[PDB]
Amino acid sequence: RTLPPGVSDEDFTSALTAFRDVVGDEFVRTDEAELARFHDPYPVGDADAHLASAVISPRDTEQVQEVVRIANRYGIPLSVISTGRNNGYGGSAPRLSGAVVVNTGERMNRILEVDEKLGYALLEPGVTYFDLHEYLEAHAPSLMIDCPDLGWGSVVGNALDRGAGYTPYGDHFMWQTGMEVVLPQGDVMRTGMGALPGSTTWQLIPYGFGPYPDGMFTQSNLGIVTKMGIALMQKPPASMTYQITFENESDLEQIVDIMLPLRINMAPLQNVPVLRNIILDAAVVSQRADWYDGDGPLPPEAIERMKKELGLGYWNFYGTLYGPPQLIEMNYGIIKDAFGQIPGSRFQTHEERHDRGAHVLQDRHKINNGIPSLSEMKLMDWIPGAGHVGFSPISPPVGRDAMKQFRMVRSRADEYAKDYAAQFVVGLREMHHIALLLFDTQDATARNETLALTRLLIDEAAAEGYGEYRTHNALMDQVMGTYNWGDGALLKFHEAIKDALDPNGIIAPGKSGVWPARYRGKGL
Amino acid sequence: RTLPPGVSDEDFTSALTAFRDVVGDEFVRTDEAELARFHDPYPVGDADAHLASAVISPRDTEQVQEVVRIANRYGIPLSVISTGRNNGYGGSAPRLSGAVVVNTGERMNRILEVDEKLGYALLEPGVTYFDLHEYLEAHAPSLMIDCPDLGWGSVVGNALDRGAGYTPYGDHFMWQTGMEVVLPQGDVMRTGMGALPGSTTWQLIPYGFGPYPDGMFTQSNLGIVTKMGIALMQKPPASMTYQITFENESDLEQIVDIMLPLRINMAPLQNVPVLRNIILDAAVVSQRADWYDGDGPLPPEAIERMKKELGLGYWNFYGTLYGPPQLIEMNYGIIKDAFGQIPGSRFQTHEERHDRGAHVLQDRHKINNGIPSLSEMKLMDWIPGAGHVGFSPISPPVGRDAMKQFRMVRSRADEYAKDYAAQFVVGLREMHHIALLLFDTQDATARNETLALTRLLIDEAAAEGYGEYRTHNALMDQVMGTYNWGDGALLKFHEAIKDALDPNGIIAPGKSGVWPARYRGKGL
Numbered sequence A, B: 001r002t003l004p005p006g007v008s009d010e011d012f013t014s015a016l017t018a019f020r021d022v023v024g025d026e027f028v029r030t031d032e033a034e035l036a037r038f039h040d041p042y043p044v045g046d047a048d049a050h051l052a053s054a055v056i057s058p059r060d061t062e063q064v065q066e067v068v069r070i071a072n073r074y075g076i077p078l079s080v081i082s083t084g085r086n087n088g089y090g091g092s093a094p095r096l097s098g099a100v101v102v103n104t105g106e107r108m109n110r111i112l113e114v115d116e117k118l119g120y121a122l123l124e125p126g127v128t129y130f131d132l133h134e135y136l137e138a139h140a141p142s143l144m145i146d147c148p149d150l151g152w153g154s155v156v157g158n159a160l161d162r163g164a165g166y167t168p169y170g171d172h173f174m175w176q177t178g179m180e181v182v183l184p185q186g187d188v189m190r191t192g193m194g195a196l197p198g199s200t201t202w203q204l205i206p207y208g209f210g211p212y213p214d215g216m217f218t219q220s221n222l223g224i225v226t227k228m229g230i231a232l233m234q235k236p237p238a239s240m241t242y243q244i245t246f247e248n249e250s251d252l253e254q255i256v257d258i259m260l261p262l263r264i265n266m267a268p269l270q271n272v273p274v275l276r277n278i279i280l281d282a283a284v285v286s287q288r289a290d291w292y293d294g295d296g297p298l299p300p301e302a303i304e305r306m307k308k309e310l311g312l313g314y315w316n317f318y319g320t321l322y323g324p325p326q327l328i329e330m331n332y333g334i335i336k337d338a339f340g341q342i343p344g345s346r347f348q349t350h351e352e353r354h355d356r357g358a359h360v361l362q363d364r365h366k367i368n369n370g371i372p373s374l375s376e377m378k379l380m381d382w383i384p385g386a387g388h389v390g391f392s393p394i395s396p397p398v399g400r401d402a403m404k405q406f407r408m409v410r411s412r413a414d415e416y417a418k419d420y421a422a423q424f425v426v427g428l429r430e431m432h433h434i435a436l437l438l439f440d441t442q443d444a445t446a447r448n449e450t451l452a453l454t455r456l457l458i459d460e461a462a463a464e465g466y467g468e469y470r471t472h473n474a475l476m477d478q479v480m481g482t483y484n485w486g487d488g489a490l491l492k493f494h495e496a497i498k499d500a501l502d503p504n505g506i507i508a509p510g511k512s513g514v515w516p517a518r519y520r521g522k523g524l
C-alpha cells in the first residue's frame, strides 16, 4: 500500500479518516483503479517514479482549508491539480512520489462570473477551455477564450504552470487577474483588488496595493488556488488564418529574422506566430510507419515524401489576422511581401486549402480564434505507445540562435534514436524552441533514452544561455539547478519563502525544484 | 540629533563608521542641510513626521550588500530611493521616521545596455527619464521611453512603485523585465532568465522558471533593486494628439461609457486616455488668484470664466494616435463620430491649437510620444506653497461609477477647503480617479485638513468598492488596512514573507503597511 514519504501507516490512516469527515467517503479515493488513473501517461525513466497515495476532492475553498489543516496535523504532503492534463510534464502525478493529490477541479468546476462588457471571467479550477468556450457561446458570445492546443485543460491549471495559447491573449498569466488561494497552513487569501472587501474591480487590474504576489503562485507549491480571474478578449469582426510553407531547412534563419520585426509591435503579426517543422505537421495527419518502417533516424527522402505528399515545407508558418476585411487584406499584403522574399515560400489562407496538408492550418484557425480542439492529440498516433516530454528553452528571436538550436537538438535526437519534431514560437521579444520528443512509453529502453536525451538537451541549451521555461517532474531539480546565478541565489530565495509559508512542508514538495526543509537534500 | 528607532546612540555611531568604511565618508551624509534635502517637499501631517537620520550612497551592488549586512549587525532600518522624486507619496522621506536612506541613484546611475533591435534597456536606479530619452535619441533613436508627467523621476524607482505613463507601454511594471535585487540580509539574486548564468534573454521575457517573484519587489520592502530591465517601444512612423472639450460636468457619465469600448481593444484609443477637469487644466497655465481672491470654494461663475477664457470644457479629453497618416485619420474619424454624439463636444489636434488653452494638449503630445517634460510642475504654482498628496482609487470604467466618485470626492474637497482638480484615466479595463489635492505646505491647518480629507476619501472610496492603488507614507497603514479580506490575510501573508527574508527587520519598515516583527504594533 503506497504511503507518503515520512508518514507512518498510523498517521496516514488517521489523516484519511479526517479527510473523509471533511469531503465525504466518495471523495477520498485510495482504490488501485483510481490511483492508476493519476499515473503520468508519458513517464520518462521509471514508469513507477511518481505515484499517488490517495486523491482528495474538496467541495469548496472551506474544505480545501480543512484538508490542508489536516495534512499539517499529520505531515501529509499534498500535490495539486485542477484538471490534471499536464501531459508532457507529469500529467496528474505528484513530483514527490507517495503524495496525496488534491483534485480541485472535480467539484470546484463552476464559472462563477462572466462580465461581457468589461471582458472577464471568475473561474474555479475545474473549468476546462471547452467549458468556458461553451459558456461564452451560450451567454457572452462577443467574447472568446485563449486556449492551448488541447481544450481539455484547465483555464486555471494551465495559467498556474504559465502555459500559453496563440491569440493576442496568449500569455495566460498576464491576463490572469485576481486569485483566491489557500496558503500552506490553511489560511485563505485574495490577491489584488479582491483583498478589499466588497471591491468591484478584482478582475479589472491584476495589482492591488503593496507587493504583487500572484506570480509567486505560478510554477509554485506556495498554495492551492480556489478561484482565478481572467480577462477575455472581444471577438474581432473577422479573422483569417494563413500557412506559409518554406522548402529548405536552412530557411529557418531568414524566417525568424523576418518574423521578429513583424511581431514585436504586435502587427502585422497580430497573434502568436508558430513555425512548425515537417514532422510536427505530418504527425497530425499520418503515422511514422507510412513514411519509414526501418531502424534509425528518418531518412531525408522520407522527409521529402512527407513534404511532397502533404504539400508542406520543411518549416510551416501559421498566423492569424483580425479585424475588418480591409485591415486583414492590408496586413496579409505586408506579410506576403516580407516572407515572399524567401525563395520557395508558398502562401495559403484557411479559405484556400482543405486537403490533408491543411489539417493543421484549419486547427490553428480554430485555436487562434479561441475555438478549443483535441485534433493535436492525433500527434500521439505517430508511433505505438507514443508519449511526449516537454523541452522548450527560451532564446533571442534571432535566426542565428534558431539555426544553432535546430542543429544542436536534432543532432542529439538522431544520436538518442528520437525524431526531431519541433516548432519555433515568438511570443513578443522571446523565442521558444518547443521540441515534441516522442517515445514509446511501453519500452523501458525508449523511456530511459528519452530522459537521458532531455537531460543532455537541457544542459547543452543552458551552456549556450538558453533556459528551460517549463519542465517535467523528473527534470525539475536539474532545470532549477541551471538557474544558479550567484551560487544558487534564486533557489535559496524560494526555499526561504517556502519554509516561511509552509513550516510543516506540506504543499507539492519539490515543484520547480523547491523542497521544504523536511524533504530537501533527500534525492526524494 | 535624529536617531533611528530601536538603535542606541552607540550602535548608530558604530554603524555610521561601518557605512563610511565601505562607501567612503563623502557618501555618508548626516549634516542638517543634506538631511533637509530628503524632507518630503509636500508634507501632510506634521512637517517633521518622516525624517532621515543619515543618507548612504553605495557605489555598486557589492556595496549595497555590505551596507545591508552592516544594517543587520546594528539593527539600522534602511529606507530606499532611486532618484527620490516620489512627490505626492513622501518624496525621498522614509516611512519609518529616523531611518537611514539608501540613495541607490547617486552612484548607480548607468544605462548598462540598450538593444535597439529587440527593444530593451538594462538600467541602474539613477537613470532618469530625461537620461534614457537623451541616450535613445543619441544611440537608439527608433525607440522611445514611457514617462510619467515629470521626467526627473527614475525609470527604475517609478516602476518599483508601480507608477505609470501614457504611451501603449504605460504600465511600467508590465514592461519591467528582469531585475537584480539585494535581499534584506545582504544576499543578491537575479530574477527571471537572468538567474541562468550567461543568458541572452534577461530582458526578453519577465518569467524564468519556478515562482515569478518580481512583483514582490514593487511597492515593497523585500529588497534593494540594483539593476532593472525594461522593454522599449518602437516609435511609430507618425503620431497625432487631440483634445476633446466637453462643456458640462454631467457629460462625465457618457464620456466614460463611450471611452471604455474604444479603449478595451487598445484601438482606436491607442494610448492611455486621460480626462482632466477644468481646474487641472487651468492650473497649468494660470494661478487660482487670477480667477478668484475671495474665500471658500471657487464659485461656479469662476469655473465658467476659466472655461470661456481658456476655450476649455469642464472635462478635457487628451489622446494620441500612432501609425501611418491613413490609420491616424481613420481612427480619429471613429473617435470624432463616437464622442461627437455628446452635445457641445469640440475637437482640436496638436497641429490646430497653440493658444494658452492648448498648453496641456502640447505637453500631452510630448509625454504620449515618450518626450519627457517638467511642464506639469506649473500646477504647483496654483496657490502659494502648493503641495499635493496622491489619491487615485481604482473603479470600473463605467459612467455611473465615474459620476458617483466625481460627486463624492468634490463634495468632501469643498468641505475640507481644497479645490477639486482631478482626472479620470482608463488603463485598459480599469479606471483611476486621480485627484490632485493641492494644499499650502506652510500652513499647519492646511496640512492637517489635507491628511484628514484624504483619510476620509480613502474610507468612503473603500466602502464603495474602490481601493487605492498607491499612497503616501502617512496613509500606508490605513490603505493596507482597507485590503483586509479574510481578517487581514493579505497583510499576514506579507508579514510572514517579510519576517522570513528580513529577520532583523531592516528594509523600509512599514512600506505598504508591512512592518517587520520588531516594529509592528508600535504606532511606529
Ligand SMILES: Cc1cc2nc3c(=O)[nH]c(=O)nc-3n(C[C@H](O)[C@H](O)[C@H](O)COP(=O)(O)OP(=O)(O)OC[C@H]3O[C@@H](n4cnc5c(N)ncnc54)[C@H](O)[C@@H]3O)c2cc1C
Residues within 6 Å of the ligand: A080, A081, A082, A083, A084, A085, A086, A087, A088, A091, A092, A104, A125, A147, A148, A149, A150, A152, A153, A154, A155, A156, A157, A158, A160, A161, A162, A163, A164, A165, A219, A220, A223, A224, A225, A226, A376, A377, A379, A388, A511
Ligand atoms: C500534444 C501536446 C500539446 C500541448 N500544447 C500545449 C500548448 O499549446 N500550450 C500549453 O501551455 N501547454 C501545452 N501542452 C502542455 C499541457 O498538456 C497543457 O499545458 C495543459 O493544459 C496543462 O494541464 P491542465 O490544464 O490540466 O493543468 P493541471 O495539470 O491541472 O495543472 C498544471 C499544474 O498547475 C499546478 N496547479 C494546478 N491546479 C492548481 C491549483 N488549484 N492550485 C495550485 N497549483 C495548481 C500544478 O503544479 C499542476 O501540475 C501540450 C501537451 C501536449 C501533450
Ligand SMILES: Cc1cc2nc3c(=O)[nH]c(=O)nc-3n(C[C@H](O)[C@H](O)[C@H](O)COP(=O)(O)OP(=O)(O)OC[C@H]3O[C@@H](n4cnc5c(N)ncnc54)[C@H](O)[C@@H]3O)c2cc1C
Residues within 6 Å of the ligand: B080, B081, B082, B083, B084, B085, B086, B087, B088, B091, B092, B104, B125, B147, B148, B149, B150, B152, B153, B154, B155, B156, B157, B158, B160, B161, B162, B163, B164, B165, B219, B220, B223, B224, B225, B226, B376, B377, B379, B388, B511
Ligand atoms: C504633479 C505630479 C504629477 C505626477 N505624475 C505622475 C504620473 O504621471 N505617473 C506616475 O507614476 N507618478 C506621477 N507622479 C508621482 C511621482 O512623483 C512619480 O511617480 C515619480 O516618478 C516617482 O519618484 P521616482 O521616480 O523618483 O522614484 P523613487 O522616489 O526613487 O522611488 C519610488 C519608491 O520605489 C521604491 N524604491 C525606489 N528605488 C528602489 C530600489 N532601488 N530598490 C527598492 N525599492 C526602491 C521605494 O518605495 C521608493 O519610495 C506625479 C506627482 C506629481 C506631484
Ligand SMILES: C=CCc1ccc(O)c(OC)c1
Residues within 6 Å of the ligand: A087, A088, A149, A376, A389, A390, A391, A392, A434, A436, A470
Ligand atoms: C505541440 C506542442 C505545443 C506545446 C506548446 C507549449 C508547451 O509547453 C508544450 O509542452 C508540451 C507543447
Ligand SMILES: C=CCc1ccc(O)c(OC)c1
Residues within 6 Å of the ligand: B087, B088, B089, B149, B389, B390, B391, B392, B434, B436, B470
Ligand atoms: C497630475 C497628476 C498625475 C498623476 C498620475 C499618477 C499618480 O500616481 C499621481 O500621483 C501623485 C499623479
